[PDB]
Design a protein around this ligand. Sequence first.
Ligand SMILES: O=C(Cn1c(Cl)cnc(NCC(F)(F)c2cccc[n+]2[O-])c1=O)NCc1ccccc1F
Lengths: 11, 26, 250
Amino acid sequence: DFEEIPEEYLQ
Amino acid sequence: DCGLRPLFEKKSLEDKTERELLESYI
Amino acid sequence: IVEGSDAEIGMSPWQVMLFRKSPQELLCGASLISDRWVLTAAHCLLYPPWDKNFTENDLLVRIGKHSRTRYERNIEKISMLEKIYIHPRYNWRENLDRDIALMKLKKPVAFSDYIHPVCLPDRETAASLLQAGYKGRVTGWGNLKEGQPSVLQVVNLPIVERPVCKDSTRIRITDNMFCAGYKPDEGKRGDACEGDSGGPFVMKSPFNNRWYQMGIVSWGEGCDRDGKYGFYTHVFRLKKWIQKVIDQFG
Ligand SMILES: O=C(Cn1c(Cl)cnc(NCC(F)(F)c2cccc[n+]2[O-])c1=O)NCc1ccccc1F
C-alpha cells in the first residue's frame, strides 16, 4: 500500500 | 548538535511522554 | 510496535526507513547518526537462513518521515547508499551477536526540523544510563500485533536485569545485547515487532538533555508475549568498531 515515489530516486 | 530536536529541545518544548523516561532515572 | 502510540511530528528526527525498491516495501528501521551515516541491524541486510542478502543498489533510505506509506513531498528525503558495512563478526548462524551495520549515503542529507542526528553514547553516559529499571524509547513502522500503522509509533520500555533476560529464552545471550520490556506482573506492556528491526532504542540524558542511541532493535520471540523480552544490540560495546569504520571510510 506504499505510494509511488519519484522515479528520479529509483534510478 | 546531535540529540537536540529542532521541534522540542531547541524550543524548550517537551514531548508528551519524555517525562516518563526522566522519572525512571532514579 | 505493539501497544505503542502515534509519534508526534518531529519527535524522532533521526528515525530512518530502510526501503526496498522492488517490490517497494518497508524493510527495517534505522537511525541517522551524521549527515552521511546511517546505523541499522545487520540482519536487515544479511540473513542467509532466509536467503536475505541485500546490496547498496537494492535499497533506498528515507529520512524525515512520519506516515509509513505516503511519499511526504517537501518533507522526507530519499537517499541512495554508497557502501554497506556489516560487522565482520556478526553471528547470524547462532544468536545474532553483533547485529550491527553502517550505511554510508552517496551525498550528505541536509538537516531540517524533521531530520536531525541522534548522539552515540560515551562510556560515561552508557555507564550511568544503561541500568535495569531505566526506560528507553523505541520507534518504528512495524506491525502492531504479532495491520501496520498509519504513522510512526513509539513506546517507552524499561531495561531488564541480565539474569531475567537470560532466564526467558533458550538463546545464548552475550555481552553485546541487552533486553527490555515489562515483566508480566508489571501491568504495562509493549514491544517492537516485525518491521521495527534496525530501529533505535534511545534514552534522554538528564545531564545534558540530549538523546543518545543505546540500542538497535535486534530480535525477539514473538511480539509483546508475556515472560518474553525484546533484545537490542548494545551500541556502546560496539562503538570502537563504529569509530573504526567511520574514520577509516569517511
Ligand atoms: O525479526 C527480527 C529478527 N529475528 C531473526 Cl532474523 C531471527 N530470529 C528471531 N527470533 C527468533 C529467535 F529464536 F529468537 C532467534 C533469535 C536470534 C537468532 C535466531 N533466532 O531464531 C528474530 O527476532 N527481529 C524483530 C523483533 C525484535 C524485537 C521484538 C520482536 C521482533 F520481532
